[PDB]
Amino acid sequence: GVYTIAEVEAMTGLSAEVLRQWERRYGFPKPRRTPGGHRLYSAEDVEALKTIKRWLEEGATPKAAIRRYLAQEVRPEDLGTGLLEALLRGDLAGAEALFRRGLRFWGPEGVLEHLLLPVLREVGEAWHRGEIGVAEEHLASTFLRARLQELLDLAGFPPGPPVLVTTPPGERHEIGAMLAAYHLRRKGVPALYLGPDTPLPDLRALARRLGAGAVVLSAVLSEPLRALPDGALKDLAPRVFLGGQGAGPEEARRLGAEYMEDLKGLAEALWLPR
Numbered sequence: 001g002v003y004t005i006a007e008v009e010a011m012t013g014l015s016a017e018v019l020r021q022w023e024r025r026y027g028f029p030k031p032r033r034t035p036g037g038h039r040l041y042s043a044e045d046v047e048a049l050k051t052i053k054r055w056l057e058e059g060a061t062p063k064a065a066i067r068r069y070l071a072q073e074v075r076p077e078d079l080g081t082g083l084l085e086a087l088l089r090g091d092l093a094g095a096e097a098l099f100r101r102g103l104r105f106w107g108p109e110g111v112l113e114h115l116l117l118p119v120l121r122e123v124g125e126a127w128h129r130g131e132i133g134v135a136e137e138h139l140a141s142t143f144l145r146a147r148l149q150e151l152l153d154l155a156g157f158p159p160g161p162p163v164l165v166t167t168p169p170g171e172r173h174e175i176g177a178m179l180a181a182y183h184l185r186r187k188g189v190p191a192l193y194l195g196p197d198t199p200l201p202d203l204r205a206l207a208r209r210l211g212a213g214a215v216v217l218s219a220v221l222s223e224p225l226r227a228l229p230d231g232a233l234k235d236l237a238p239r240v241f242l243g244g245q246g247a248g249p250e251e252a253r254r255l256g257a258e259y260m261e262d263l264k265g266l267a268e269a270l271w272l273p274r
């Protein structure tokens with residue numbers, strides 16, 4: 001069930017003014033609205049506000065108290081599990097807080113390996129078991145993809161012609177592409193992550209537009225590659241690389257791309273001027 005703002009004020013001791021200020025300033029709580037525009041708070045929120053009210057009475061300040069409810073109590077080893085639960089619940093303010101706390105323990109590489117990728121993989125494993133719908137999966141993936149972009153920037157951006165990283169059309173698995181994008185930046189290659197499922201005409205256009213010297217594709221499934229016409233990856237970039245479990249030398253040769261098994265060889269090839 002849910003409650004009106006007048007009811008929450010009586011149950012918590014917090015004024016309506018303060019409740020609205022917190023929502024505007026710290027993103028919590030985040031009630032839905034009636035047709036009239038009136039706020040409706042969940043029971044979980046009310047119990048959360050009672051907790052926060054108690055901490056304030058014990059000497060805490062509003063922002064820190066709210067931060068403590070969203071993230072700050074969770075121990076480092078459980079940041080991964082904590083972030084996953086927040087995303088499937090639709091709590092993005094909580095998820096952002098957990099992500100921030102993660103950056104307090106780890107550098108960019110650490111957050112990638114211990115938060116983002118394990119959670120994104122857990123989201124997928126959950127969907128495959130049918131425990132979540134597509135809307136939940138989309139909401140979580142979009143969150144994690146945006147954070148990944150932020151991690152890439154934290155790793156620094158090398159000069160030189162950019163390298164576009166994505167997945168073949170129809171390929172929704174992007175953890176390999178994400179991993180490649182970061183590895184390239186760490187190894188000094190100006191990689192730009194585009195996200196998955198980039199149509200070939202749009203990709204060819206963007207490469208010409210940005211003056212990219214290379215394009216990297218990650219294939220987990222072998223089927224989206226079999227669907228592509230012969231030499232469909234020929235005229236995308238000066239050099240076009242293909243990798244992942246769903247790719248091999250033969251299929252790469254018939255698509256007009258160069259096969260790479262590991263990321264180490266990929267970076268070493270991108271260092272070349274050709």
Ligand code: B12
Pocket residue numbers: 120121123124125127128137141172173174175176177179180216217218219220221222241242243244245260261262263266
């Ligand atoms: C997460 C996930 C998803 C997520 C994707 C999340 C995301 N945004 O990426 C979601 C939920 C969207 C998903 C959907 C589907 N999935 Co899925 N998914 C998985 C899961 C759990 C993990 C996949 C993964 O992340 N692999 C990790 C890969 C990407 O990276 P890595 O191995 O660590 O990569 C290494 C190397 O390969 C290298 N590498 C990788 N890329 C590159 C690139 C280059 C250039 C180089 C050099 C190297 C390189 O880098 C790493 C070095 O260590 C697997 C099951 C499993 N446990 O494997 C199923 C799985 C991969 N999916 C599968 C399928 C079939 C699908 C669907 C297409 C169909 C379906 N319903 O089952 C749907 C698509 C729905 C749609 N049309 O929208 C099947 C694949 C079967 C097959 N034919 O091989 C699996 C195996 C599940 C199963 N049925 O058993 N999936």
Ligand SMILES: [Cl-]
Pocket residue numbers: 005037038039
């Ligand atoms: Cl209201």
Ligand SMILES: [Cl-]
Pocket residue numbers: 063
């Ligand atoms: Cl502050």
